[PDB]
């Protein structure tokens, strides 16, 4: 068979990932332009929402050193790849969990619908990658919204998870923070209610 060059092997981001990718969090001085947790400017179209969550280990203990990256379409279901701080909306962002509270937050808008390769529309979702000490290779997952049952029911990706009970792990529960629209999405790496992780 034909073999290509091998991809560089992954390695855990380790406990100090923050110094490299979450400067503020590391409690170090930031640079002029930093990639962080505010994807949308007040003035960006779409429903502005707040995302928050906690990460749990196999013992049910909070993971206070996680690093997450997110990718989502804009309110129009368009992926805005040209990252710029001047953008009203950026499709990419980064967040991390408090060493104390252990909670991450992200400020965005609700993503528009996009079609899979076969032309079928997928339910609104945010692609997430998680990194942390103890994780050799990052975990891929998706965040869906509880207020979109109809779409969720028809998502071709969500429909690929064999057991319906497992699908539920991917649904963020709508709440409100300071009378602001929020969704809580807790990730459970291992054990009871273990979050579904993807390979692609």
């Amino acid at each position: 068979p034909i073999e290509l060059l091998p991809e560089t092997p992954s390695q855990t981001a380790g406990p100090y990932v923050h110094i490299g990718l979450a400067l503020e969090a590391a409690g170090n001085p930031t640079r002029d332009q930093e990639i962080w947790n505010r994807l949308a400017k007040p003035d960006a179209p779409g429903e502005h929402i707040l995302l928050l969550g906690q990460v749990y280990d196999g013992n049910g203990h909070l993971v206070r050193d996680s690093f997450l990256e997110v990718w989502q379409a804009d309110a129009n279901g368009e992926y805005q790849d040209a990252y710029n701080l001047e953008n009203a909306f950026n499709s990419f962002g980064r967040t991390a969990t408090t060493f104390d509270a252990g909670e991450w937050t992200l400020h965005t808008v609700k993503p528009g619908v996009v079609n899979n390769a076969a032309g079928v529309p997928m339910a609104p979702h945010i692609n997430i990658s998680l990194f942390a000490r103890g994780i050799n290779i990052h975990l891929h997952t998706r965040l869906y919204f509880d207020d979109e049952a109809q779409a969720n029911a028809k998502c071709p990706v969500l429909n690929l998870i064999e057991q319906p009970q497992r699908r539920e792990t991917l649904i963020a529960k709508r709440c409100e923070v300071d009378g602001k629209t929020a969704y809580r999405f807790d990730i459970r790496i291992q054990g009871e209610g273990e979050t579904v992780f993807f390979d692609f």
């Binding site: 992954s10 590391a26 701080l85």
Partner: protein, 233 residues
């Protein structure tokens, strides 16, 4: 906006370290017990941010000036970023972080007894050029002890994060130094089952790139998932 025009070669999860590698203690409780669910690639997975427009400072990639001169071995770390097809990956984001010459990180949580260097931060970033090259100038990091086994030591390493053309290519890894006797003993290095894969994480001394009477240089090339056009889809 981005468009779904390519497919990425499937990752080899037997080449990369598995999730559960018991000698690396923390991985016990941080590894999923259910199998990953494979999903076909869509625009969601085949696109990613482009950092061409990010405003980088003039010394973003220079750790000797981005934070007096730091104490330690002056070195340049450079290489190329290509895909599995050998194609250069231009304008891609390369981020790095490391400890000081003593193995001390500039982080709250680092309580190792080796002191902090008043002139060393240890964070760098560089956008690869039109040919896929990147370069940094820093000092060589010191190994450091960690609470795993009763006497575990991380071989000196530099942390790297690479964006690539999609979220499908994003990768975080660690570069090690050619000949470090600590590599073969590290449970994290050993999280990688294939010895051949380990070789891939070893930076080679590159005397060709060194600045006589100034600094040495190490070469570290990075290979990201091969990128191809869709066909008969």
């Amino acid at each position: 906006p981005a468009q779904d025009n390519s497919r990425f070669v499937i990752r080899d999860r037997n080449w990369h370290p598995k999730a559960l590698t018991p000698d690396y203690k923390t991985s016990i409780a941080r590894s999923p017990r259910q199998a990953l669910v494979s999903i076909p690639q869509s625009i969601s997975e085949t696109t990613g941010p482009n950092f061409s427009h990010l405003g980088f400072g003039a010394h973003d990639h220079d750790l000797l000036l981005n934070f007096g001169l730091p104490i330690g071995e002056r070195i340049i770390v450079a290489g190329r970023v290509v895909d599995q097809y050998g194609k250069p990956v231009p304008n891609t984001l390369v981020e790095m972080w490391q400890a000081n010459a003593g193995g001390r990180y500039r982080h709250k949580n680092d309580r190792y007894l080796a002191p902090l260097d008043p002139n060393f931060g240890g964070v760098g970033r560089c956008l690869t050029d039109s040919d896929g090259y990147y370069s940094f100038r820093t000092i060589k990091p010191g190994p450091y002890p960690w609470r795993n086994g009763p006497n575990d030591w991380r071989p000196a390493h530099i942390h790297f994060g690479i964006s690539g053309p999609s979220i499908a290519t994003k990768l975080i890894t660690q570069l090690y130094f050619e000949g470090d006797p600590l590599i073969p003993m590290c449970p994290i290095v050993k999280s990688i089952a294939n010895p051949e894969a380990v070789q891939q994480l070893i930076a080679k001394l590159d005397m060709n790139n060194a600045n006589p009477m100034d600094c040495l240089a190490y070469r570290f090339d990075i290979v990201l998932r091969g990128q191809r056009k869709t066909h008969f889809e």
